[PDB]
Amino acid sequence: QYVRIKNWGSGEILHDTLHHKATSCLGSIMNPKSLTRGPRDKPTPLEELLPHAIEFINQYYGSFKEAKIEEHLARLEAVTKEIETTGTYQLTLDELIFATKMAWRNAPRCIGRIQWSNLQVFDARNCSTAQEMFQHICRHILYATNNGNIRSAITVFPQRSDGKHDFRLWNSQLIRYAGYQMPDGTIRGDAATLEFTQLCIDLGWKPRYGRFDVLPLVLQADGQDPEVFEIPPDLVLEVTMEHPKYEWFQELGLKWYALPAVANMLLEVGGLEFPACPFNGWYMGTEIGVRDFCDTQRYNILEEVGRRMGLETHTLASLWKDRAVTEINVAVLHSFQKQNVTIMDHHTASESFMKHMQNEYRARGGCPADWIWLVPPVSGSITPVFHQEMLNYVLSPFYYYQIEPWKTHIWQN
Amino acid sequence: QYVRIKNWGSGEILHDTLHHKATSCLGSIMNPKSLTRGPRDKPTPLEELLPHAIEFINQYYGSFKEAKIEEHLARLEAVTKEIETTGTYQLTLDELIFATKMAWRNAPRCIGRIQWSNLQVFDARNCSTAQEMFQHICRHILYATNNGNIRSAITVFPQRSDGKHDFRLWNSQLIRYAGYQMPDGTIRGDAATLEFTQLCIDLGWKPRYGRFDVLPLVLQADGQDPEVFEIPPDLVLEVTMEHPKYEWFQELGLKWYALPAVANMLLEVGGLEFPACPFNGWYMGTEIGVRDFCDTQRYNILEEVGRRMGLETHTLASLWKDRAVTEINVAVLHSFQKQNVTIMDHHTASESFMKHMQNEYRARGGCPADWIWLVPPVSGSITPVFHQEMLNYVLSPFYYYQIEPWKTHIWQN
Numbered sequence: 001q002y003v004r005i006k007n008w009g010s011g012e013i014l015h016d017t018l019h020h021k022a023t024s025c026l027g028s029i030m031n032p033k034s035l036t037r038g039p040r041d042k043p044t045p046l047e048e049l050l051p052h053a054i055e056f057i058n059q060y061y062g063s064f065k066e067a068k069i070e071e072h073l074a075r076l077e078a079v080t081k082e083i084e085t086t087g088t089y090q091l092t093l094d095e096l097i098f099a100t101k102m103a104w105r106n107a108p109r110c111i112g113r114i115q116w117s118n119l120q121v122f123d124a125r126n127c128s129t130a131q132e133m134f135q136h137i138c139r140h141i142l143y144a145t146n147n148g149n150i151r152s153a154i155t156v157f158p159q160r161s162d163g164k165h166d167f168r169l170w171n172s173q174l175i176r177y178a179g180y181q182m183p184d185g186t187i188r189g190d191a192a193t194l195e196f197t198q199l200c201i202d203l204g205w206k207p208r209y210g211r212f213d214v215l216p217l218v219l220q221a222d223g224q225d226p227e228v229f230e231i232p233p234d235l236v237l238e239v240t241m242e243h244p245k246y247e248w249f250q251e252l253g254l255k256w257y258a259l260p261a262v263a264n265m266l267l268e269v270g271g272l273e274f275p276a277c278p279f280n281g282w283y284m285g286t287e288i289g290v291r292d293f294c295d296t297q298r299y300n301i302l303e304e305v306g307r308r309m310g311l312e313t314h315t316l317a318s319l320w321k322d323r324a325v326t327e328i329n330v331a332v333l334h335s336f337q338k339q340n341v342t343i344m345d346h347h348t349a350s351e352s353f354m355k356h357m358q359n360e361y362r363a364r365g366g367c368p369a370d371w372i373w374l375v376p377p378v379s380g381s382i383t384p385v386f387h388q389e390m391l392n393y394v395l396s397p398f399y400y401y402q403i404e405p406w407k408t409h410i411w412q413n
Numbered sequence: 414q415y416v417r418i419k420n421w422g423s424g425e426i427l428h429d430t431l432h433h434k435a436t437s438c439l440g441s442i443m444n445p446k447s448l449t450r451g452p453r454d455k456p457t458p459l460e461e462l463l464p465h466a467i468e469f470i471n472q473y474y475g476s477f478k479e480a481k482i483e484e485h486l487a488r489l490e491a492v493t494k495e496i497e498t499t500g501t502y503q504l505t506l507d508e509l510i511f512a513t514k515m516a517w518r519n520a521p522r523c524i525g526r527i528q529w530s531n532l533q534v535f536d537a538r539n540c541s542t543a544q545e546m547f548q549h550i551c552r553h554i555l556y557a558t559n560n561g562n563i564r565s566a567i568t569v570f571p572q573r574s575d576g577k578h579d580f581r582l583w584n585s586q587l588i589r590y591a592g593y594q595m596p597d598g599t600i601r602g603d604a605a606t607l608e609f610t611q612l613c614i615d616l617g618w619k620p621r622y623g624r625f626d627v628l629p630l631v632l633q634a635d636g637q638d639p640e641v642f643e644i645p646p647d648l649v650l651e652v653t654m655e656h657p658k659y660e661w662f663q664e665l666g667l668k669w670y671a672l673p674a675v676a677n678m679l680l681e682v683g684g685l686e687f688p689a690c691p692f693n694g695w696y697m698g699t700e701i702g703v704r705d706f707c708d709t710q711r712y713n714i715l716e717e718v719g720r721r722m723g724l725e726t727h728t729l730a731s732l733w734k735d736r737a738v739t740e741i742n743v744a745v746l747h748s749f750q751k752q753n754v755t756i757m758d759h760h761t762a763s764e765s766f767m768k769h770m771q772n773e774y775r776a777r778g779g780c781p782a783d784w785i786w787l788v789p790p791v792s793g794s795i796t797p798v799f800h801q802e803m804l805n806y807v808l809s810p811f812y813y814y815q816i817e818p819w820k821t822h823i824w825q826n
């Protein structure tokens with residue numbers, strides 16, 4: 001019938017029926033196969049493609065306020081013919097737009113989903129070369145940034161045909177800092193991008209050997225070898241970190257790019273797969289302040305900010321780590337707000353998601369949600385999301401992870 | 414072969430093989446059936462009991478440094494005879510001790526598991542009346558408290574025979590505060606214990622209508638009706654909350670009991686079930702400071718502590734909630750330390766668990782772990798546990814949840 005869901009903070013109860021439409025214990029696995037859509041060397045079998053296509057065409061037309069039956073049946077016929085005569089089909093622009101938003105709506109790990117219907121779509125399915133890709137990605141970055149007034153957008157490249165002509169971005173994110181394995185045993189920049197920074201070098205990128213060196217776009221088009229392209233500095237907007245009280249904070253010489261843009265995910269819709277569809281929204285403070293700046297595998301600036309504050313950084317029970325991390329978060333929020341760059345704190349983000357969740361249950365009886373990702377990296381139980389029981393399931397359309405390109409790519413020269 | 418586990422903070426990899434011995438997507442469900450062992454009206458079927466018994470007897474003897482084969486085979490024979498002639502069997506004291514520690518060792522939701530081998534066991538299997546139960550529980554509380562130098566202990570009551578003579582504690586925890594639905598629409602005390610506080614009243618308990626009113630032990634013995642017993646105040650040690658800087662903190666008039674003792678769980682071992690086996694360890698600061706004091710469904714003192722600090726408690730982006738919660742945590746840790754009562758901060762707890770996890774993988778190739786519970790309610794990613802991929806599975810011996818007694822109990826008079 002349905003699965004009962006309870007919120008322990010407010011006591012509210014919800015009835016999840018949406019999970020019945022799911023596709024298919026692995027507790028806290030980061031990249032499980034269930035969330036990964038790998039490569040192919042052959043086209044999608046027709047017996048599989050068609051049911052998926054029809055099911056999507058039904059979902060699309062069944063989403064209008066007032067149904068348009070005539071067009072619905074006609075699209076059903078045309079789609080079938082297209083598959084019969086070409087082996088695959090082309091989505092109409094409206095269907096693609098609808099698909100990108102739904103896939104976002106169905107992202108279990110996204111806290112910003114209340115914004116799902118507000119997405120700019122850049123149709124780059126006609127694209128054919130890396131240079132054209134690069135031009136599209138620049139247009140994206142420029143539009144999305146909007147001089148600090150960040151706008152959510154997505155750029156869709158040509159769908160996978162036989163799997164040997166995949167368009168792919170080798171970058172994890174569009175804008176991302178380089179990480180170098182410095183001489184003195186240390187690490188410079190972003191330690192998370194170590195292996196990738198090297199790959200860029202192995203392809204002719206000039207390592208400016210620093211701290212906040214924006215890495216280059218590594219683009220693969222039509223299954224061909226990846227080409228390195230440096231991002232025009234004018235396009236990369238950054239925020240300089242300043243604390244509203246600790247003047248010594250700017251002495252840390254920290255900053256971060258204002259554009260969070262996922263670049264390596266695959267968009268699945270109606271049997272079709274889009275191995276290249278970079279998308280972005282805006283930042284949530286804790287991502288920068290807590291994960292980027294404080295993870296030990298990242299910038300790891302925690303102890304340092306502790307000392308400058310004069311905390312007993314040698315006694316854990318003093319809760320010094322709790323103290324520093326909050327000041328860093330305050331810095332981030334203050335800096336973005338001052339420099340007129342869109343930012344959202346985790347508390348406001350949570351309430352926003354909660355409101356969204358409630359809208360989703362009223363609108364379609366469910367909201368796929370991954371508690372482990374939806375709960376902020378700090379002040380967990382202080383946010384409403386923590387007390388909300390959730391159901392994690394994979395719907396369609398959906399944004400899947402992909403196997404890293406350098407592991408499967410067959411080189412030409 | 415095995416499941417690969419990775420820690421994203423340190424990069425370490427672990428191979429989980431222990432999950433193969435497990436008994437048997439529900440994301441963040443609080444009380445799932447997989448963790449609940451319900452009631453019975455008939456004895457455990459022999460075809461089921463015996464394999465479970467033999468398997469436990471093998472585990473027990475197979476845990477010694479140097480095996481004692483002779484005794485092992487003899488116990489196997491005797492156990493079989495006992496089941497053949499009585500329909501069930503009695504654990505030896507050593508086996509029970511071993512079982513209680515293993516079940517703790519196998520508690521996926523416990524962060525304090527590094528202490529698993531340090532458990533005092535009180536054999537109360539000979540118990541037969543509520544008065545005797547009450548006396549045992551008092552001896553427990555007194556021993557465990559040890560005048561602030563908290564000691565981990567467990568008291569085992571008679572095992573379930575036919576399910577119609579179950580020994581059960583109706584209390585969630587041994588020491589717990591009452592919650593009253595005051596006149597003025599508000600709530601007094603602990604809002605979590607509302608329904609239960611009433612039940613105590615419906616059984617003759619005198620509602621002292623306050624804030625920190627220690628509730629009474631509601632004991633069910635031999636399947637008979639529950640009897641109410643007030644806990645001797647001298648036994649209940651408490652800590653008064655004091656901030657080392659904000660002198661106005663004591664004006665809040667807050668405190669908390671120093672003894673965290675789970676009272677409603679069922680111990681499962683070798684086919685046998687113990688519906689009454691209260692146990693305790695020591696507190697982890699955030700439990701009191703964050704959950705008990707700050708959950709909106711609990712004491713909800715967050716805004717109040719914010720005001721006293723002079724924070725913009727009307728602007729979420731100011732991160733005022735993050736500020737208050739940390740001071741409360743500092744208060745708790747400071748108070749317990751000052752009053753010489755055992756307490757542990759969440760940072761030290763995490764490192765402790767991490768060390769434990771590593772010992773467990775080296776010792777037996779696994780450690781059942783529930784990430785959702787193991788990660789502190791604040792400073793999530795700041796703790797090592799957050800970056801540790803985990804596997805959640807149910808082993809045996811194990812501590813299960815039970816269906817609340819008032820929902821299934823058949824009243825006599």
Ligand code: HEM
Binds near residue numbers: 113262
């Ligand atoms: C408008 C503001 C948005 C905010 C504040 C937001 C925030 C976030 C956050 C905090 C995460 C977790 C990231 C991490 O920890 O690695 C996330 C994940 C995700 N978001 Fe959103 N998001 C927004 C817009 C979008 C858009 C426009 C899309 C897609 C059309 C999207 C798709 C996703 C997906 C697929 C993930 C998973 C990424 C992964 O698994 O690594 N988000 N987002």
Ligand code: HEM
Binds near residue numbers: 526
């Ligand atoms: C020595 C110190 C110990 C510490 C610091 C510790 C701490 C904790 C914490 C923080 C939780 C989560 C509680 C909650 O959020 O409701 C927990 C759960 C648990 N602990 Fe430990 N524990 C300790 C000892 C013990 C002992 C001695 C046992 C049993 C023999 C035990 C059994 C469990 C079980 C079964 C749970 C799950 C409770 C539930 O699901 O509601 N703990 N413990």
Ligand SMILES: C[C@H](O)[C@H](O)[C@H]1CNc2nc(N)[nH]c(=O)c2N1
Binds near residue numbers: 029373421799800803
């Ligand atoms: C091991 C664990 O799954 C991993 O470290 C997580 C957990 N929660 C997360 N939540 C978010 N938002 N982002 C993340 O990267 C992670 N990583």
Ligand SMILES: C[C@H](O)[C@H](O)[C@H]1CNc2nc(N)[nH]c(=O)c2N1
Binds near residue numbers: 388390443
């Ligand atoms: C909904 C969610 O499962 C619930 O609120 C949780 C999550 N994490 C927890 N973790 C601990 N330690 N204790 C808890 O009570 C909970 N409750």
Ligand SMILES: O=[N+]([O-])c1cccc2c(Br)n[nH]c12
Binds near residue numbers: 287
């Ligand atoms: O805001 N964030 O922290 C954040 C993190 C990771 C991916 C995205 C996207 Br797409 N929008 N916002 C994001």
Ligand SMILES: O=[N+]([O-])c1cccc2c(Br)n[nH]c12
Binds near residue numbers: 693
């Ligand atoms: O320390 N704690 O926060 C805590 C919470 C809940 C149950 C227990 C036990 Br048993 N020991 N410590 C506990």
